[PDB]
Amino acid sequence: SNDNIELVDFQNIMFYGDAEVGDNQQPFTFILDTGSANLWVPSVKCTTAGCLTKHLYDSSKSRTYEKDGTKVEMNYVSGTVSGFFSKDLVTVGNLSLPYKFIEVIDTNGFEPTYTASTFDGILGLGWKDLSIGSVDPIVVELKNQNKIENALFTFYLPVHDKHTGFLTIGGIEERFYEGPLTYEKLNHDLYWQITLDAHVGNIMLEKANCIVDSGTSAITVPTDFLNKMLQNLDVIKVPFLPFYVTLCNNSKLPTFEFTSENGKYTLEPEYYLQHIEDVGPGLCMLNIIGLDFPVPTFILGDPFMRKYFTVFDYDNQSVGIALAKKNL
Numbered sequence: 001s002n003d004n005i006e007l008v009d010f011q012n013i014m015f016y017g018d019a020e021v022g023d024n025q026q027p028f029t030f031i032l033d034t035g036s037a038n039l040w041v042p043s044v045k046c047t048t049a050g051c052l053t054k055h056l057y058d059s060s061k062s063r064t065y066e067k068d069g070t071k072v073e074m075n076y077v078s079g080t081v082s083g084f085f086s087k088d089l090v091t092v093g094n095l096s097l098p099y100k101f102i103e104v105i106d107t108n109g110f111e112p113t114y115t116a117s118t119f120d121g122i123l124g125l126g127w128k129d130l131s132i133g134s135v136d137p138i139v140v141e142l143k144n145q146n147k148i149e150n151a152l153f154t155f156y157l158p159v160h161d162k163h164t165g166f167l168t169i170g171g172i173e174e175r176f177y178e179g180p181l182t183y184e185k186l187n188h189d190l191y192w193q194i195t196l197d198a199h200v201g202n203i204m205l206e207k208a209n210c211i212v213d214s215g216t217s218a219i220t221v222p223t224d225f226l227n228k229m230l231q232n233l234d235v236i237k238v239p240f241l242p243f244y245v246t247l248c249n250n251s252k253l254p255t256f257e258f259t260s261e262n263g264k265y266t267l268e269p270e271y272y273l274q275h276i277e278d279v280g281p282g283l284c285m286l287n288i289i290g291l292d293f294p295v296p297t298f299i300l301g302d303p304f305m306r307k308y309f310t311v312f313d314y315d316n317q318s319v320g321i322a323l324a325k326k327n328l
């Protein structure tokens with residue numbers, strides 16, 4: 001059997017899951033992020049305003065706590081947290097392991113994201129060589145300890161109103177998907193990144209890097225490619241922000257089509273549009289952001305993963321992709 005962690009939707013933009021730290025089972029809510037490779041929780045030693053409404057970690061209450069204290073700063077694209085390393089029993093679903101994590105004491109570099117969102121910490125689901133402190137990934141460690149069948153995990157993302165989701169550790173369950181499951185070989189050692197041809201109508205990018213990322217709540221697109229997409233599309237940019245607004249029923253809005261020799265994955269407007277009726281009637285925001293990597297790259301974030309069930313397979317160094325079942 002497999003370890004199943006339930007995923008709760010947060011206003012159709014993101015999702016969260018719970019896990020515990022300490023032998024007294026101190027509860028936390030996590031962003032589960034395939035794009036990073038460290039676990040962190042806010043500490044009772046936290047000095048900053050963000051920590052005020054969070055579940056906090058108290059090492060003195062856990063008899064399995066092992067002191068480390070090495071200083072560490074965790075830099076993400078959207079901000080920084082700092083604190084120090086600690087080690088304790090981490091439990092995910094019904095499995096436990098001793099695990100090295102970051103006790104965060106300063107979250108001021110992660111504002112306003114942190115105070116506005118209802119997560120306590122971030123649980124990384126990436127590769128070891130992307131971690132600070134050379135930490136073996138949780139799922140690799142669980143496999144090594146014979147607590148799961150395979151060194152893989154899967155995401156069946158919740159759909160607002162329709163159903164909850166699951167992060168499943170250790171194997172692939174048929175209940176989550178329909179049609180074929182296609183495996184795409186990783187093109188990098190330490191990112192969940194695959195090679196796909198990216199088509200949006202006339203515009204194409206041959207053999208683009210495509211990162212499948214659970215922690216990114218948009219599709220990201222190279223800026224040049226995006227500028228070509230938005231030309232004559234009747235969308236308007238929000239002042240001061242990298243977001244475009246449209247009429248929801250704008251007939252011009254294209255369908256993303258990513259292809260390999262193995263498979264074909266499409267993303268229609270209904271999957272990348274976000275209603276903003278409160279802002280104005282019949283108005284939608286595109287969940288699409290222009291971003292230039294050194295090599296042309298798309299991030300296939302939460303909107304892609306809402307449509308597609310995904311398998312992250314360490315042993316076979318690949319990402320599996322299938323159409324998510326509309327219900328459970």
Ligand SMILES: Cc1cc(N(C)CCN(C)C)cc(C)c1OCC(=O)N[C@@H](Cc1ccccc1)[C@H](O)C(=O)N1CSC(C)(C)[C@H]1C(=O)N[C@H]1c2ccccc2C[C@H]1O
Binds near residue numbers: 130289
């Ligand atoms: C950890 C790390 C270490 C090293 N190093 C140096 C390691 C070296 N080691 C040996 C010490 C080098 C790198 C690059 C690295 O990755 C940094 C990192 O931030 N990666 C992001 C993915 C990404 C990557 C590139 C460009 C955009 C996004 C992460 O996985 C994620 O998903 N994050 C951050 S925190 C969050 C909230 C979980 C969510 C995030 O920011 N989400 C926001 C976002 C982002 C883009 C577009 C829209 C939106 C809306 C919102 O969802």
